[PDB]
Design a protein around this motif. Structure first.
Motif, PDB file in Angstrom:
ATOM      1  N   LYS A  45       0.827  -1.201   0.000  1.00 25.71           N
ATOM      2  CA  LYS A  45       0.000   0.000   0.000  1.00 25.71           C
ATOM      3  C   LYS A  45       0.865   1.256   0.000  1.00 25.71           C
ATOM      4  O   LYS A  45       1.642   1.486   0.927  1.00 25.71           O
ATOM      5  CB  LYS A  45      -0.927   0.006   1.217  1.00 25.71           C
ATOM      6  CG  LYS A  45      -2.144   0.900   1.051  1.00 25.71           C
ATOM      7  CD  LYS A  45      -1.816   2.351   1.364  1.00 25.71           C
ATOM      8  CE  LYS A  45      -2.941   3.280   0.935  1.00 25.71           C
ATOM      9  NZ  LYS A  45      -2.664   4.694   1.310  1.00 25.71           N
ATOM     10  N   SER A  46       0.725   2.067  -1.044  1.00 24.85           N
ATOM     11  CA  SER A  46       1.495   3.298  -1.166  1.00 24.85           C
ATOM     12  C   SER A  46       0.575   4.495  -1.383  1.00 24.85           C
ATOM     13  O   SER A  46      -0.073   4.613  -2.422  1.00 24.85           O
ATOM     14  CB  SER A  46       2.492   3.190  -2.320  1.00 24.85           C
ATOM     15  OG  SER A  46       3.095   4.443  -2.593  1.00 24.85           O
ATOM     16  N   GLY A  47       0.523   5.382  -0.393  1.00 28.86           N
ATOM     17  CA  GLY A  47      -0.321   6.559  -0.495  1.00 28.86           C
ATOM     18  C   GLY A  47      -0.307   7.394   0.770  1.00 28.86           C
ATOM     19  O   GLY A  47      -1.353   7.845   1.236  1.00 28.86           O
ATOM     20  N   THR A  48       0.881   7.597   1.330  1.00 26.28           N
ATOM     21  CA  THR A  48       1.027   8.380   2.551  1.00 26.28           C
ATOM     22  C   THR A  48       2.274   9.255   2.497  1.00 26.28           C
ATOM     23  O   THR A  48       3.336   8.837   2.036  1.00 26.28           O
ATOM     24  CB  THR A  48       1.103   7.472   3.794  1.00 26.28           C
ATOM     25  OG1 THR A  48       2.095   6.459   3.600  1.00 26.28           O
ATOM     26  CG2 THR A  48      -0.244   6.825   4.074  1.00 26.28           C
ATOM     27  N   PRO A  49       2.145  10.501   2.980  1.00 26.62           N
ATOM     28  CA  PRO A  49       3.252  11.461   2.998  1.00 26.62           C
ATOM     29  C   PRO A  49       4.334  11.078   4.003  1.00 26.62           C
ATOM     30  O   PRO A  49       4.228  11.389   5.189  1.00 26.62           O
ATOM     31  CB  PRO A  49       2.577  12.771   3.412  1.00 26.62           C
ATOM     32  CG  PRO A  49       1.368  12.352   4.174  1.00 26.62           C
ATOM     33  CD  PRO A  49       0.907  11.066   3.545  1.00 26.62           C
ATOM     34  N   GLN A  50       5.372  10.403   3.520  1.00 26.67           N
ATOM     35  CA  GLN A  50       6.472   9.979   4.377  1.00 26.67           C
ATOM     36  C   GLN A  50       7.783   9.936   3.599  1.00 26.67           C
ATOM     37  O   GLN A  50       7.811  10.194   2.394  1.00 26.67           O
ATOM     38  CB  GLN A  50       6.177   8.604   4.978  1.00 26.67           C
ATOM     39  CG  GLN A  50       5.380   8.664   6.271  1.00 26.67           C
ATOM     40  CD  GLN A  50       4.572   7.406   6.518  1.00 26.67           C
ATOM     41  OE1 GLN A  50       4.405   6.575   5.623  1.00 26.67           O
ATOM     42  NE2 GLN A  50       4.065   7.255   7.735  1.00 26.67           N
TER      43      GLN A  50
ATOM     44  N   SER B 288      11.286   8.447   1.799  1.00 25.26           N
ATOM     45  CA  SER B 288      11.427   7.487   0.711  1.00 25.26           C
ATOM     46  C   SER B 288      12.899   7.193   0.433  1.00 25.26           C
ATOM     47  O   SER B 288      13.776   7.993   0.759  1.00 25.26           O
ATOM     48  CB  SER B 288      10.754   8.017  -0.556  1.00 25.26           C
ATOM     49  OG  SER B 288       9.352   7.816  -0.511  1.00 25.26           O
TER      50      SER B 288
ATOM     51  N   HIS C 146      10.132   0.014   2.999  1.00 27.51           N
ATOM     52  CA  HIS C 146       9.424   1.271   3.213  1.00 27.51           C
ATOM     53  C   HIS C 146       9.845   1.914   4.531  1.00 27.51           C
ATOM     54  O   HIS C 146       9.658   1.337   5.603  1.00 27.51           O
ATOM     55  CB  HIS C 146       7.914   1.037   3.206  1.00 27.51           C
ATOM     56  CG  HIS C 146       7.123   2.211   3.695  1.00 27.51           C
ATOM     57  ND1 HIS C 146       6.295   2.952   2.880  1.00 27.51           N
ATOM     58  CD2 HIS C 146       7.036   2.770   4.925  1.00 27.51           C
ATOM     59  CE1 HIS C 146       5.734   3.918   3.587  1.00 27.51           C
ATOM     60  NE2 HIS C 146       6.166   3.828   4.831  1.00 27.51           N
TER      61      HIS C 146
ATOM     62  N   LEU D 285       9.351   4.436   7.430  1.00 25.18           N
ATOM     63  CA  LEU D 285       8.293   5.200   8.083  1.00 25.18           C
ATOM     64  C   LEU D 285       8.852   6.466   8.724  1.00 25.18           C
ATOM     65  O   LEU D 285       8.442   7.576   8.387  1.00 25.18           O
ATOM     66  CB  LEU D 285       7.597   4.343   9.141  1.00 25.18           C
ATOM     67  CG  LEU D 285       6.962   3.043   8.643  1.00 25.18           C
ATOM     68  CD1 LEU D 285       6.794   2.057   9.787  1.00 25.18           C
ATOM     69  CD2 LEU D 285       5.623   3.326   7.979  1.00 25.18           C
TER      70      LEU D 285
END
Length: 155
Positions: free
Chosen positions: A9-14, A16, A142, A144
């Motif tokens: 799941k990719s769709g959050t401002p964090q 990279s 990923h 966090l």
């Protein structure tokens, strides 16, 4: 025979990868650098390159592996690679899970535990501990958030 149960799941401002940033101040002994993130279901392998922006010298280079499940720990000094070893009682790292790497400095050696489960150790190859300022992290995982606190002693 190999399938996937969990889904990415990719769709959050964090943050990279590759993640290349420096700390306001140079880390070292007594300091505790943790890395909170999550592995991908179809992640090949990740790695954490810790060097000192000062002389862009990699003090510690821990690059884990899932495929064969072999943990690699080496250092790069003076544009030279030491001796990469491989020997672990078990591989905790898992694709699509929450792993936390805690880096504590006791002015004696570089300790690294995952999910609060000591795995392997690596003597302080780098003399200048108050040099490490830049934290490089790459791989197929990923990120966090990265925390860094002194870390008191309660027990």
């Amino acid at each position: 025979g190999s399938s996937g149960s969990s889904g990415p799941k990719s769709g959050t401002p964090q943050l990279s990868l590759p993640f290349a940033a420096r700390l306001n101040t140079p880390m070292g002994p007594g300091r505790t650098v943790v890395v909170k993130g999550e592995v991908n279901a179809n992640a090949k392998s990740f790695n954490v390159d810790l060097l000192a922006g000062k002389s862009k010298d990699i003090a510690l280079h821990l690059n884990p592996r899932l495929n064969i499940k072999a943990f690699v720990r080496n250092s790069f000094l003076q544009e030279s690679w030491g001796e990469e070893e491989r020997n672990i009682t078990s591989f905790p790292f898992s694709p699509g899970m929450y792993f936390e790497m805690i880096i504590y400095c006791d002015v004696r050696e570089f300790k690294v535990a995952v999910n609060g489960v000591h795995s392997l150790e690596y003597k302080h190859r780098f003399k200048e501990l108050s040099s490490i300022d830049t934290l490089e992290i790459n791989g197929d995982i990923h990120l966090l958030e990265v925390r860094s606190w002194s870390g008191p002693s309660s027990g």
